[PDB]
Design a protein around this ligand. Structure first.
Ligand code: AGS
Ligand code: MG
Lengths: 129, 319, 258, 258, 254
DNA sequence: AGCAGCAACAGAGAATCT
DNA sequence: AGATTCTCTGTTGCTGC
């Protein structure tokens, strides 16, 4: 069991951040959890990989479902992220600050107390590419 | 004119650890370290202008005495700090023989450690590990996350925080007493308000106001050093009626020469860091502030786009 | 203390040229009978060992041995001030933090003096030389350099094979194979061109071409090179000096070992 | 079979230096009257054509022509073992998978032998040389090299213009323009420095400077260079050998064509 | 107009070799008493100043001064056609858009002619040379080059210190420190090897090694180099030509 | 789907030594 | 005068932002 030095100097594996984005703690303020997650997503600098992780995980996550609209609202964000990511190669990277907001929409929409188990993930996109 | 005088930030730069009005805990820690010796590897992180470089400089000076010239190796971001430099010069300095007191060690100060490349940072690990009995490393950075975890594992971590109102007020009062300047309470209050925990910026604004008007008054400070940019943006976004926000944007920001890019970007920051409203409405406001940004980055940056962004934010806040 | 004056700075410069590139740290030790120096590369397949007797110097004084380690690169950087004809004096106290190199021209005129920072290296000189080697051979060093330079182009491994009255160097790689075969012979018209060979047992060893290339540099110190091979130990390539020698011990490749 | 022995490995090395860089694959063919070789660059604007008669060799035997293709780079990599004074023998059977280069010193001593892997190339030798060219001129090759080296700096195109008793090389680009004008002349004090010109029709062609730069290498094979130009075909730059020649045919730029 | 013919293209090529690398733009001006040229590097710590009198040329004609600026890199690119022994003629009209370099061999044979595009530079020649310097010294330029080449390896700063009858060059950096001490002396066996020194006041200045390295190039123009130092101004390193000189003024490190 | 900053490797030119 | 070695410059590739 070695992890103390990691907590001391290492960040949050993007996978751990994805599993944390689908978890809500019932004992903490939702706003404090949101700012803690925002800081973790910003410190990682790899918002794209976190979002791709969220995209692969969301169909397998338990989320109180009314008509699966939550997925429809998230397709519009994901489309907003793809436009932003295309614009990063055309324009000086001022737009990079908004990239951390798209992963946090998953915490708002799909974050549930039911999601206690870590879902492992893979990279279907590199294989598909 | 023939020559200039030294600025008050450099002239009154602290040379002893007692003159630092920063974080008391870390300051007393470094003072006791310099008193006893055995300085370990350290990484000091924080925000610009809070006493990080001055702190490590004072520590090295007090710890080395007269041997500061031949026992301290200073490397800033202005010098090459790549893999070749770490391989040759840093290793030659760490391997250099030097007769020091039985409580001191050679210090390698690396300013702006968050800018060193990954190769140099990786090579520095064994460099600081094999010569940890005659050479010590002190990093000074603004983002501790930019330094690799193996390097952080071999050193202490000192996180410097913002300077409270009392500390900056005390330092400014000391500077005024040492300089015999005419001031007033509201002027110092406005200076500290425009400083935002930045001691260097506070002293710079004080010196500029003194050299421009002579009397440190809130009117002079506000006419020379415009009010904080983020506060007017926050007051504009937190407006309850559309006409008030529009008038604020027109008079305070647009009629004073603030570019639309600065307005929208400052706007994004204010929102991200907002705490008055809920999370969902904040995310919707950030979303709207984004479309206006995309349109302004495409060259469509005008007052109409910001007005439409404010209208959409108010419509979101309109339940 | 260290006090060694070379007649010509050139000799020391060529000696250091030999350690150059293939090693980073060198450990020198001066004593009553001269100066020795050893350097081992990072992979530990090559040892460079020097010995300069008292007679190689114009002036040498030692009443107290001194051991000093230094970065080879730093030393060579400073080793191009000798004008070759300049006089060079190495100087150091009994507990040095530096080594002083003093170059002076005959007349009082120009004096270039350097103070090189030393490195602390755990004193641990190796004594890996053998009593007898399977085979021993010497030949002109320029010839050995050509042989190495030829074959090097073909492979990263050059094999040396010795049988009665036959020495054969071989390289075999992608573009093909090559070989250089030489035979022992005494040239009275000038014996510095002869090729001697004493074989007690046939040998067949492989060396990493990159290392043999480092070794050939010794040609600049001696007309001939001695090569001693054994199946029990690193091979020895030796370049004699007037009162001294520069030796390179190279471990044979096991199958993949430089 | 192929069996060609060059007196000096140097001649072959300089010949290959000519194909070097500007072409990747070369197709050789030995036969009863000698050896020929052709190589065309990828863009097909340059053809390098060689002919070495039987008399250029110290020993040549051919009872059965052999065609063999190879990578130029691989060949040159191996072509620095000739010591220049070494003897070189090219050897190959009638259905080769390789070409053997055998370098030997006068005495039995060093024998460097290479076995180069061959490439299969569809035999298709071109015969694009013309009966008559619009204009013909020869001048010292070192002079031609200087002319090319001058102008090259100014543009990627160098124009050659010929009128009665006048040869003019011109380059014009960003930094400005340059020109070198030479006139025919017979120097009896040594005719290898003369500049001959036979013009049947004025010519004016443009060539890509990068190619002329490849061509000037032939200076190392001959004192003079012959240049034959036509508005109907690639220009011919020729470097004579003792019994043989190295020829470079270069297509003029159409407006943009090397 | 500009009409200056050099006997040997080599002289001009070596002169330009001196401006080479350390400066990008050079401003030439021909006039009745010769040609002058000035170039300042971007950081403004080095000024390269040339003067070639009428007598240095085989033929010189000037009835109307012409000032012309150009990119040195472009100039040197063209300055390797002189065969050294070729004759070189610089030519330009009174309101030039270009400068013509004409290289010709003795015989009518080969004529290489270039037309270099000019740059417009605000004419502003500096006149920073001093009446008296604290100290003045001359020594063989090859010796000065060696001194600079030695020390350069040790540091980016080389200090020159002068006291009565003593000149000392010093460098001190990471690997250690070095120094070269020379003393004034008259060699009658050939005075071009002597080392003269006239000291009115001891001096001690530091210069950036990268710049001294640029300056040593002048060795190719003269056997000796004159060095004039002052605590009040840029140091002057001078290489004399037959009728002329190439000067390098270098600001000491603060 | 630029740039840049980089760093490393290869080639060419110049200088020194035999 | 020729050959070899070393140094400098340019180009290409890889990594990071
Ligand atoms: N605690 C302090 N007490 C007194 N003066 C201070 C203090 N902190 C900063 N200053 C002043 O600010 C100047 C600059 O401080 P620095 O230590 O360079 O700032 P910093 O905290 O290192 O942030 P950087 O350098 O932008 S990353 C000093 O020379 C002082 O004049
Ligand atoms: Mg700082």
């Amino acid at each position: 069991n070695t992890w103390a030095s990691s907590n001391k100097d290492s960040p949050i594996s993007w996978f751990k951040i994805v599993n944390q984005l689908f978890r809500k703690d019932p004992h903490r303020d939702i706003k404090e959890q949101f700012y803690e997650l925002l800081n973790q997503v910003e410190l990682n600098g790899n918002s794209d990989r976190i979002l791709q992780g969220c995209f692969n995980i969301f169909p397998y996550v338990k989320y109180s479902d009314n008509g699966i609209r939550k997925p429809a609202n998230i397709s519009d964000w994901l489309f907003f992220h793809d436009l932003m990511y295309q614009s990063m190669y055309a324009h000086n990277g001022e737009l990079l600050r908004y990239s951390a907001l798209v992963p946090l929409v998953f915490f708002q929409t799909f974050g549930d107390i039911a999601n206690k188990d870590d879902i492992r993930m893979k990279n279907s996109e590199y294989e598909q590419r | 004119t023939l020559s200039l005088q030294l600025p008050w930030v450099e002239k009154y730069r602290p040379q002893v650890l007692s003159d630092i009005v920063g974080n008391k805990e870390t300051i007393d820690r470094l003072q006791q370290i310099a008193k006893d010796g055995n300085m370990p590897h350290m990484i000091i992180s924080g925000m610009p202008g809070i006493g990080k470089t001055t702190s490590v400089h004072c520590l090295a000076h007090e710890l080395l005495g007269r041997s500061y010239a031949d026992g301290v190796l200073e490397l800033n971001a202005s010098d090459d700090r790549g893999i070749d430099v770490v391989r040759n010069q840093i290793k030659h300095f760490a391997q250099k023989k030097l007769h020091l007191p039985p409580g001191k060690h050679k210090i390698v100060i690396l300013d702006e450690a968050d800018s060193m490349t990954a190769g140099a940072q990786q090579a520095l690990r064994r460099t600081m590990e094999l010569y940890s009995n005659s050479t010590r490393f002190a990093f000074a950075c603004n983002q501790s996350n930019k330094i690799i975890e193996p390097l952080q594992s071999r050193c202490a971590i000192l996180r410097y925080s913002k300077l409270s109102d009392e500390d900056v007020l005390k330092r400014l009062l000391q500077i005024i007493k040492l300089e015999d300047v005419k001031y007033t309470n509201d002027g110092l209050e406005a200076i500290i308000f425009t400083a935002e925990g930045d001691m260097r910026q506070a002293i710079n604004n004080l010196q500029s106001t003194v050299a421009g008007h002579g009397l440190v008054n809130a009117d002079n400070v506000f006419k020379i050093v415009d009010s904080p940019h983020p506060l007017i943006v926050k007051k504009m976004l937190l407006a309850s009626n559309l006409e008030d926000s529009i008038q604020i944007l027109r008079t305070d920001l647009w009629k004073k020469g603030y570019s639309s890019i600065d307005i929208v970007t400052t706007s994004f920051r204010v929102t991200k860091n907002l705490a008055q409203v809920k999370e969902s409405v904040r995310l919707e406001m950030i979303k709207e502030i984004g479309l206006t940004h995309m349109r302004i980055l495409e060259g469509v940056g005008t007052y109409l786009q910001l007005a439409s962004m404010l209208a959409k934010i108010h419509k979101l806040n309109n339940k | 203390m260290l006090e060694a004056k070379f007649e010509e700075a050139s000799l020391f410069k060529r000696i250091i040229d030999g350690f150059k590139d293939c090693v980073q740290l060198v450990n020198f030790q001066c004593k009553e009978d001269g100066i020795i120096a050893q350097a081992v590369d990072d992979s530990r397949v090559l040892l460079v060992s020097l010995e300069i007797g008292v007679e190689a110097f114009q002036e040498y004084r030692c009443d107290h041995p001194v051991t000093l380690g230094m970065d080879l690169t730093s030393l060579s950087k400073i080793l191009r001030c000798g004008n070759n004809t300049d006089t060079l004096t190495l100087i150091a106290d009994n507990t040095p933090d530096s080594i002083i190199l003093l170059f002076e021209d005959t007349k009082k005129d120009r004096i270039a003096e350097y103070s090189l920072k030393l490195m602390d290296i755990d004193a641990d000189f190796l004594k890996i030389e053998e009593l007898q080697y399977d085979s021993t051979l010497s030949l002109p060093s320029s010839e050995f350099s050509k042989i190495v330079r030829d074959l090097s182009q073909l492979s990263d491994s050059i094999n040396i094979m010795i049988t009665k009255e036959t020495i054969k160097f071989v390289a075999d790689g992608d573009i093909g194979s090559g070989s250089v075969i030489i035979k022992p012979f005494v040239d009275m018209e000038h014996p510095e061109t002869s090729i001697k060979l004493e074989m007690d047992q046939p040998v067949d060893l492989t060396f990493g071409a990159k290392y043999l290339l480092d070794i050939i540099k010794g040609s600049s110190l001696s007309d001939r090179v001695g090569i001693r091979l054994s199946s029990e130990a690193p091979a020895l390539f030796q370049f004699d000096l007037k009162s001294g020698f520069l030796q390179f011990f190279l471990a044979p490749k096991f199958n993949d070992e430089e």
